[PDB]
Ligand SMILES: CC(/C=C/C=C(C)/C=C/[C@@]12O[C@]1(C)C[C@@H](O)CC2(C)C)=C\C=C\C=C(C)\C=C\C=C(C)\C=C\[C@@]12O[C@]1(C)C[C@@H](O)CC2(C)C
């Protein structure tokens with residue numbers, strides 16, 4: 020497939036990485052009874068670890084000659100790997116940043132601003148917190164309006 | 170004249186109304202709005218109880234008044250002619266409260282009108298014989314009234330305990346007074 | 354704030370203002386307050402008449418062909434299963450011609466509603482005109498050829514209309530549940546009325 | 556007229572669909588509020604339209620009048636390429652939206668002496684050739700237009716989400732519920748929201 | 749005036765003006781007067797829900813301990829659910845809508861005295877007035893109009909209401925910490941204690957709790 | 958308690974009452990949605 024690398028749903032090495040990890044935990048689980056506490060953990064981990072492999076095979080990631088899932092970072096077979104998450108960040112980071120902007124400016128005009136950086140006006144911040152939900156629509160409109168730059 | 174002699178009545182009860190014997194432990198009659206309503210429910214309630222306890226006895230002077238539910242025009246056929254007739258009548262009484270005079274005039278035969286009258290005591294048509302005189306009657310009315318109201322709950326708890334009606338439950342009491350109480 | 358001395362539906366209650374006893378059949382019923390804005394009373398007042406006169410016609414169209422067909426005279430069917438497929442033209446056309454002839458008459462009537470004297474004269478035989486009524490919904494002339502001149506009369510119209518409009522709602526309702534003609538519903542009710550209410554049948 | 560009676564409406568709505576809703580305070584900038592009002596207006600008109608061609612088809616199909624597919628499966632069909640259809644559409648709309656955009660910038664702008672009687676009216680309400688019948692004292696129409704709009708905007712988001720969840724027609728979803736309302740819900744499916 | 753801890757004077761922020769004011773806020777929680785206006789409603793509602801709940805158990809439980817029909821309050825949710833037609837998720841969601849509505853309106857009366865009063869609803873203007881933070885009254889909340897009766901008669905009930913409130917809140921939590929420590933109904937916890945009270949205590953099984 | 962709340966609204970206290978929140982949130986989401994390399 021892309022860069023000649025196999026899909027994880029098919030690839031042998033990936034499916035032999037399944038086996039090795041599981042068959043590490045089944046060599047442990049022998050040393051305990053089935054009713055016991057740690058046996059429920061070494062079964063639950065296995066169940067989870069065997070579920071995990073299944074859920075990349077269903078996701079359809081590209082696995083190499085290594086047996087490990089590699090990622091795709093440009094265009095549309097593998098959007099969700101990077102292209103979607105990427106926006107996730109720029110949003111929540113932009114959220115944090117713009118809330119922080121609206122806080123510092125909102126304090127600025129109040130005799131001594133430095134006190135509000137330490138004894139933070141919580142009920143100011145928690146109102147700006149929610150306001151900062153719709154930030155790109157404000158951020159754009161502020162770049163337009165021309166209050167964004169000194 | 171007081172429910173508990175030597176008491177002082179509550180402030181709101183002044184012996185104006187008929188059968189005001191200074192009784193409102195929970196200042197129910199405290200607000201004039203509510204006390205105007207409660208006046209009516211206490212008339213009508215007794216009027217229905219007097220009418221009903223009068224019935225229970227005289228219908229059994231027989232079979233269980235309680236299982237009379239089981240009696241020529243189907244159930245839903247009869248519940249209709251009640252509903253519309255009762256809805257008709259009850260609304261018109263309820264307008265006389267909504268505004269004290271609003272209804273008195275025969276919508277058909279508007280020639281005939283019910284003369285100006287105190288609430289819940291309508292008269293005109295409804296006082297043909299103009300019998301015994303002035304308030305005193307309204308004080309028999311609420312007295313005889315309450316006694317009838319009480320007796321009914323009696324008649325009910327009397328059914329729901331003995332199985333028999335009123336006159337049989339009494340005949341049972343006479344037979345063994347010492348034995349046939351609630352305390353046995 | 355509300356007329357005192359005119360027809361009420363809850364005697365003792367309050368007509369609201371906008372129902373002056375001006376329009377025909379005002380006893381001042383508008384619980385939801387749909388006639389508030391006097392623009393919207395103008396429409397509804399007319400809307401009522403149209404809807405009224407279609408019902409009163411229709412309900413006669415419904416009942417009579419049963420009243421006669423049971424006495425036994427010559428074509429008589431069910432007022433819903435009637436329009437199925439049994440006519441000299443097809444469904445399609447009979448609508449087309451219907452929609453055409455109306456679209457004309459209605460835009461004529463509508464202009465008269467919009468402007469009170471706009472359409473009162475023939476535009477072909479232009480000496481022919483219906484008189485200066487000045488009363489949309491009550492246009493007159495041809496439309497009053499035997500010449501009943503009255504307030505009396507304009508009540509009797511909307512009272513019959515309100516009653517007919519229902520009767521038709523009933524016909525929809527009654528058919529949809531029971532599944533026979535409304536004179537057959539009234540027959541079975543009259544045979545044993547008590548054991549045949551709605552509540553019985555529901 | 557308030558959206559939450561008691562909540563102090565934000566100052567920047569002094570009653571110029573205004574029920575006082577702007578919690579995040581997008582439209583505090585009156586630049587942004589004029590721009591955002593026509594976003595709404597366009598969003599309403601399209602959606603009222605679009606939904607009419609999801610419901611009125613979808614309702615008549617059960618009625619039996621029209622053998623229409625479901626709105627998910629009306630895309631897929633042979634006549635022309637979709638590339639073409641989108642292109643020709645993207646071409647044709649792009650022209651006209653650009654005539655809206657210059658109106659939003661320079662209201663009158665669409666009446667240059669040089670085929671333009673489509674000058675304007677007020678902002679977001681172009682009228683004239685967009686108003687054949689011509690309707691103009693009762694501008695209550697202006698109100699319903701936003702309201703019937705926000706109702707329809709929600710309705711579509713509903714369609715999109717309620718096929719993602721049950722995978723069946725809105726005219727079906729409407730019945731399934733109406734058949735057993737208390738066992739067929741929001742609450743008896745895939746995802747809790 | 750009477751106090752929670754006789755001798756120890758009550759803290760300034762308590763006047764003897766509010767119902768059940770026994771100079772008790774040892775932790776200075778309700779000091780700022782707004783933050784106490786908030787707690788006097790929490791306490792009322794808590795106590796009103798607790799009273800309905802305590803009356804709610806105290807009747808089912810005798811109903812189950814009078815005739816073998818009614819279920820124990822603990823395992824009486826599933827018994828309502830399973831036996832009858834209904835589902836859990838929807839109830840829980842229906843509830844949240846109605847309670848959501850009911851609360852969200854009380855919600856905007858705390859911050860705004862006479863807010864919902866404006867008739868902005870179903871034309872019901874005078875029924876959703878302020879009156880007194882914690883007692884809304886009118887034709888709905890106080891139908892009989894003890895609210896609009898007499899000055900003293902109503903003042904005494906505020907007193908009765910908060911006290912019953914505080915006793916039901918205790919009562920309720922016992923029900924909840926008594927099923928826990930002994931796994932039985934509150935008229936099995938009460939019958940066992942009346943027959944042999946000296947032995948059937950916590951001392952037996954119910955530990956420090 | 959005007960004073961006690963100002964202290965609770967001090968920088969080091971808020972940071973900690975904020976981080977235990979956005980930490981839990983991320984531990985929590987990794988429980989019911991375990992092991993993500995997509996979404
Ligand atoms: C929901 C929506 C908008 C939601 C936004 C909200 C809530 C805004 C609210 C707020 O901003 C305020 C006011 C104030 C802020 O402080 C807070 C928030 C809360 C942020 C728009 C949907 C808008 C919905 C639209 C436009 C959809 C239109 C439908 C079309 C055209 C689809 C086409 C087809 O369906 C047909 C017609 C036929 C089918 O066969 C085929 C296809 C092709 C699928």
Ligand SMILES: CC1=C(/C=C/C(C)=C/C=C/C(C)=C\C=C\C=C(C)\C=C\C=C(C)\C=C\C2=C(C)CCCC2(C)C)C(C)(C)CCC1
Nearest residue numbers: 092093094101102105112113114115116117118120154158
């Ligand atoms: C897509 C993609 C890609 C690419 C990318 C690129 C190529 C980019 C570029 C970019 C660029 C070229 C950029 C630029 C920029 C500029 C500027 C100039 C900036 C600015 C900024 C600002 C101004 C900010 C602000 C703010 C906000 C908004 C919020 C927060 C706060 C603050 C203040 C910070 C890749 C392949 C990787 C991956 C996949 C996808």
